[PDB]
Amino acid sequence: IQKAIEENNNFIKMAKEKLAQKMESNKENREAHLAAMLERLQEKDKHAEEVRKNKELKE
Amino acid sequence: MRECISIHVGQAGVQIGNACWELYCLEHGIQPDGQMPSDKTIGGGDDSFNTFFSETGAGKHVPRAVFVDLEPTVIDEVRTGTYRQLFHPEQLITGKEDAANNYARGHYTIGKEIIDLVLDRIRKLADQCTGLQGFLVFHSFGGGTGSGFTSLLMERLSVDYGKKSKLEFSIYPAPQVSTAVVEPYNSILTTHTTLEHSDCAFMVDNEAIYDICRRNLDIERPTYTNLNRLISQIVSSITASLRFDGALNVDLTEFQTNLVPYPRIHFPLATYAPVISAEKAYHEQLSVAEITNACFEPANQMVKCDPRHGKYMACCLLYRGDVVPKDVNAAIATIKTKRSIQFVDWCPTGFKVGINYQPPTVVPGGDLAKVQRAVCMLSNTTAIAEAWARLDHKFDLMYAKRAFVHWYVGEGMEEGEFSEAREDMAALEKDYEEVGVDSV
Amino acid sequence: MREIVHIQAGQCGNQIGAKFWEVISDEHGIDPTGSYHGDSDLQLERINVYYNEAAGNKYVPRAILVDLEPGTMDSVRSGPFGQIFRPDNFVFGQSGAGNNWAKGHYTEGAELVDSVLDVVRKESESCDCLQGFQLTHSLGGGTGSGMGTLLISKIREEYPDRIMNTFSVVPSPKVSDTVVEPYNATLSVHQLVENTDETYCIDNEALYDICFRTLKLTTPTYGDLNHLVSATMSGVTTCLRFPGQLNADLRKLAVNMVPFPRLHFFMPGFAPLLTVPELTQQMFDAKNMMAACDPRHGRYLTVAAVFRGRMSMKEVDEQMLNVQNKNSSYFVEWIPNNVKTAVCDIPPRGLKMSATFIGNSTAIQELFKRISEQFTAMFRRKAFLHWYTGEGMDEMEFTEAESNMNDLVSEYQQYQDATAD
Ligand SMILES: Nc1nc2c(ncn2[C@@H]2O[C@H](COP(=O)(O)OP(=O)(O)OP(=O)(O)O)[C@@H](O)[C@H]2O)c(=O)[nH]1
Ligand SMILES: Nc1nc2c(ncn2[C@@H]2O[C@H](COP(=O)(O)OP(=O)(O)O)[C@@H](O)[C@H]2O)c(=O)[nH]1
Ligand SMILES: Nc1nc(NCc2ccc3c(c2)OCO3)cc(-c2cccc3[nH]ccc23)n1
Ligand SMILES: [Ca+2]
Ligand SMILES: [Mg+2]
Numbered sequence: 001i002q003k004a005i006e007e008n009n010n011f012i013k014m015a016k017e018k019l020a021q022k023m024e025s026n027k028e029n030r031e032a033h034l035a036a037m038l039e040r041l042q043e044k045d046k047h048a049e050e051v052r053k054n055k056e057l058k059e
Numbered sequence: 060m061r062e063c064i065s066i067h068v069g070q071a072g073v074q075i076g077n078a079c080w081e082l083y084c085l086e087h088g089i090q091p092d093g094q095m096p097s098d099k100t101i102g103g104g105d106d107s108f109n110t111f112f113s114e115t116g117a118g119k120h121v122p123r124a125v126f127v128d129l130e131p132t133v134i135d136e137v138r139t140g141t142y143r144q145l146f147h148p149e150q151l152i153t154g155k156e157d158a159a160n161n162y163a164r165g166h167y168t169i170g171k172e173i174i175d176l177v178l179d180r181i182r183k184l185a186d187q188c189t190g191l192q193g194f195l196v197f198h199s200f201g202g203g204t205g206s207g208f209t210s211l212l213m214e215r216l217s218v219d220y221g222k223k224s225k226l227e228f229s230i231y232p233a234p235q236v237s238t239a240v241v242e243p244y245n246s247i248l249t250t251h252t253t254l255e256h257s258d259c260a261f262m263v264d265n266e267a268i269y270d271i272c273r274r275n276l277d278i279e280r281p282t283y284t285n286l287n288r289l290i291s292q293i294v295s296s297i298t299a300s301l302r303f304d305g306a307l308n309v310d311l312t313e314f315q316t317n318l319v320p321y322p323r324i325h326f327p328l329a330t331y332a333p334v335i336s337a338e339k340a341y342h343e344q345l346s347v348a349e350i351t352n353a354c355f356e357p358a359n360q361m362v363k364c365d366p367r368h369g370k371y372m373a374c375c376l377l378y379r380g381d382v383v384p385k386d387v388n389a390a391i392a393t394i395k396t397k398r399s400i401q402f403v404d405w406c407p408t409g410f411k412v413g414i415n416y417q418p419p420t421v422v423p424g425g426d427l428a429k430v431q432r433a434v435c436m437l438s439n440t441t442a443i444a445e446a447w448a449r450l451d452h453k454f455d456l457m458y459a460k461r462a463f464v465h466w467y468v469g470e471g472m473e474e475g476e477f478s479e480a481r482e483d484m485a486a487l488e489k490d491y492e493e494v495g496v497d498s499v
Numbered sequence: 500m501r502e503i504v505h506i507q508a509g510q511c512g513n514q515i516g517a518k519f520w521e522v523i524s525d526e527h528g529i530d531p532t533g534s535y536h537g538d539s540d541l542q543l544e545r546i547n548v549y550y551n552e553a554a555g556n557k558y559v560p561r562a563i564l565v566d567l568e569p570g571t572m573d574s575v576r577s578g579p580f581g582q583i584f585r586p587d588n589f590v591f592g593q594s595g596a597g598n599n600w601a602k603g604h605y606t607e608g609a610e611l612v613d614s615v616l617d618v619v620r621k622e623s624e625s626c627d628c629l630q631g632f633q634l635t636h637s638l639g640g641g642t643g644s645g646m647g648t649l650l651i652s653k654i655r656e657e658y659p660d661r662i663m664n665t666f667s668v669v670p671s672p673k674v675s676d677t678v679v680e681p682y683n684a685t686l687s688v689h690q691l692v693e694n695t696d697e698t699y700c701i702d703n704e705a706l707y708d709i710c711f712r713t714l715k716l717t718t719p720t721y722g723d724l725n726h727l728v729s730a731t732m733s734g735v736t737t738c739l740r741f742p743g744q745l746n747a748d749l750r751k752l753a754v755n756m757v758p759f760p761r762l763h764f765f766m767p768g769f770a771p772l773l774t775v776p777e778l779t780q781q782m783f784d785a786k787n788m789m790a791a792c793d794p795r796h797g798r799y800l801t802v803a804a805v806f807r808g809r810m811s812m813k814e815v816d817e818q819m820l821n822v823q824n825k826n827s828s829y830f831v832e833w834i835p836n837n838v839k840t841a842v843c844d845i846p847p848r849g850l851k852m853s854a855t856f857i858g859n860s861t862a863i864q865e866l867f868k869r870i871s872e873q874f875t876a877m878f879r880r881k882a883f884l885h886w887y888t889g890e891g892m893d894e895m896e897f898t899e900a901e902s903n904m905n906d907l908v909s910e911y912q913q914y915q916d917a918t919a920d
């Protein structure tokens with residue numbers, strides 16, 4: 001009866017740790033994808049500023 | 060006691076839920092307002108139908124059920140429809156934005172925002188049980204919610220209710236009826252992620268249901284309503300042993316013992332008879348023998364595969380209606396002398412038989428004839444692995460090009476989950492091969 | 500509860516936008532005042548996708564109108580239905596862009612973009628659950644092509660998780676002789692490859708050839724081209740506007756149609772320009788495509804077919820299977836079940852039966868080759884480059900845009916040549 005209790009608890013434990021690891025890893029990956037996209041858009045805003053300056057300093 | 064909680068996930072799960080609960084109401088004489096005049100014990104009882112319905116002090120009989128979808132329009136039809144009074148509003152749970160046919164959104168991005176609420180409502184149902192037996196989970200393989208949220212939920216249920224039994228009714232995708240190209244991805248991801256968390260899963264191949272509706276009901280182009288009414292007849296046959304009393308009734312759990320020789324080998328093939336129109340049923344009474352013979356005709360299977368090219372590991376027959384053992388035994392004797400029924404060598408060949416005398420019911424205005432007697436066979440056959448093969452092949456075709464994979468990666472999944480799931484399916488196909496080999 | 504925000508930019512964008520709103524307002528029984536005068540609840544069941552409800556049971560398009568030329572603001576407002584649009588949703592500049600992409604994207608358009616975003620944000624804030632955005636514009640002018648892609652980039656910054664869809668009118672010498680058109684299109688395509696989920700390539704080449712050869716119009720006007728465009732766009736939004744059975748949103752459609760993020764440029768088609776077999780055969784005919792591409796010179800990654808009118812769903816299913824079986828070589832074998840079908844009971848005006856086609860075909864590379872050739876013809880002589888460098892742009896940006904569009908071509912070719920075995 002103790003072995004049975006232990007096996008049920010180990011199944012609960014391992015599923016809890018696997019789920020938590022997956023959800024954390026997923027959160028980190030999603031946030032990194034959005035941060036890379038935003039960083040590319042910020043590089044665009046930087047390039048648009050360098051364009052507007054080039055145009056100002058052409059005059 | 061020993062109650063059962065039903066959970067209906069995504070569009071297909073919800074709509075099958077609607078067909079199933081409507082049918083249960085008709086079988087037990089429960090009106091759409093929830094009243095049951097034949098039930099003389101007000102507000103409680105330990106009648107067989109209380110495994111699926113609780114009772115309020117006001118005499119309302121309330122499904123032990125949760126409906127969950129990540130968008131609202133299907134469950135909104137339940138909220139406004141004929142049976143809106145059957146369900147407490149807290150049993151009908153909806154988000155605002157669906158999983159867009161993307162497992163990753165149902166399991167992570169959107170699913171994470173509603174999982175705790177869903178668990179709280181399920182907990183509310185469980186606390187009303189004096190001896191909860193387990194869960195029935197209704198969902199498609201192919202939708203974003205039915206795949207990913209169902210997987211998430213199964214994992215959390217294993218945490219919160221331990222080894223408490225969990226059964227699935229799983230809608231297997233077919234190109235013939237409203238499909239998404241990425242459905243094979245979602246199917247492999249959910250089968251992989253749910254495999255260790257499910258004790259028994261009844262797969263329903265939409266192509267099989269579609270063919271049966273066309274061939275036997277003379278329906279040119281079956282709708283979800285036709286398919287779900289038939290599916291509900293199969294579900295009702297399976298749960299009838301839990302919902303009715305009787306001396307020849309045989310518990311579903313007792314069949315489950317026989318249907319599942321190893322934890323992973325837990326996918327029974329369902330076959331149902333008779334599926335016949337009213338026009339063809341007239342002046343043609345189908346006997347125990349005729350319906351039992353039908354059970355071994357592959358055109359009546361719920362999953363397309365050929366049991367004639369595999370081996371049986373179990374074979375149960377669940378009869379309902381005007382059926383006595385004598386006619387069952389004569390029919391089985393005939394089938395044993397006439398058909399290609401080969402068992403693996405490590406398991407006895409006896410068929411397990413249950414009978415329920417409550418007769419089959421049909422929904423009014425339906426396309427199914429009312430019959431005096433019906434039968435559902437549940438067999439554990441290696442041939443069902445063919446359905447995995449078909450699905451695995453479609454997965455491989457797409458995954459070799461990474462087609463559509465960016466939709467999953469963008470929601471936070473990694474390719475490693477794709478290849479892990481696919482390898483788990485490869486090992487499953489190998490298991491089904493190994494169990495069919497003969498002993499030393 | 501499933502709101503789409505619509506944006507139209509520049510002369511072309513505003514013209515085809517107006518025709519689109521005319522056509523769908525008619526389909527929903529909405530008159531120019533915004534009153535419902537239809538006969539059927541199916542017209543109103545998904546009205547909120549495109550229309551807000553205002554006081555008095557008024558339906559107001561969820562529509563933003565953008566140009567650097569304010570004469571189009573007047574022409575839209577007096578055009579048929581001009582009062583239906585929200586007056587605060589008109590956002591107009593002063594001096595035009597002169598077919599100069601850099602004015603639209605970097606200087607004048609940058610100046611106006613914030614007021615455009617203010618209107619976008621006010622519309623979005625009141626959405627129950629915004630699904631995303633559709634933009635109508637041409638790629639050959641200055642305002643729509645440059646400023647529209649600016650708006651796309653800024654929306655993506657503020658709504659990175661919403662779908663961005665364009666209807667992009669690709670230039671042709673048969674309709675405009677403006678010599679700088681290929682620069683504006685290449686510079687725009689470079690943006691679109693990165694920042695949209697789906698782009699319908701509506702090719703003025705194909706629309707001209709349809710009006711001339713098939714419809715027998717000796718002198719095609721913009722009105723005749725836009726009649727075809729509006730019929731296509733009505734067809735392609737039919738499934739989200741009348742649902743019937745299909746339960747979808749822009750993201751689920753995109754997920755079904757876009758197998759690789761860069762390869763999201765679709766060929767629209769329409770038939771007729773009649774049995775179901777005839778519709779089906781014609782809809783797959785090169786002559787019915789709204790992009791001047793032969794789909795038999797490539798392979799379909801994905802296809803959506805939308806049938807409108809009263810017809811047998813059995814017969815439609817049988818014919819779609821027949822066309823796939825008889826044309827199997829034109830569908831890549833490694834995406835199973837890549838052809839999707841919708842049926843809407845409500846036909847468009849003046850037809851009993853019609854078909855709208857959306858193809859994700861590698862033959863779209865022929866469009867990109869065409870534009871690419873014209874780009875190079877000028878870029879190899881640096882012709883007209885001072886128009887752009889004078890706004891601060893470097894040649895390097897032109898080199899990169901050319902290189903990215905050529906990469907897109909090569910990728911379409913790679914997937915055309917790929918095999919399962
Ligand atoms: N048998 C049957 N299958 C259905 C039904 N409704 C949908 N399906 C199948 O389910 C799959 C589509 O998944 P859905 O259940 O609609 O998707 P979902 O769970 O709502 O997930 P998302 O909508 O993507 O968020 C396809 O294979 C459909 O054919 C139904 O009522 N009966
Ligand atoms: N099909 C179609 N094409 C148009 C229409 N109006 C303009 N065009 C095309 O659009 C290009 C000119 O760009 P335009 O949008 O008018 O410039 P802008 O509005 O100032 O940004 C030319 O290549 C024309 O061929 C129209 O109503 N229909
Ligand atoms: N990607 C894609 N496909 C479309 N075709 C029809 C279709 C029907 C049933 C389907 C299906 C596709 O795929 C799964 O089942 C339309 C669109 C669209 C684009 C931009 C704006 C839009 N406003 C309304 C619609 C829409 N976008
Ligand atoms: Ca007869
Ligand atoms: Mg759904």
Ligand SMILES: [Mg+2]
Pocket residue numbers: 595596597598599640641642643
């Ligand atoms: Mg201009």
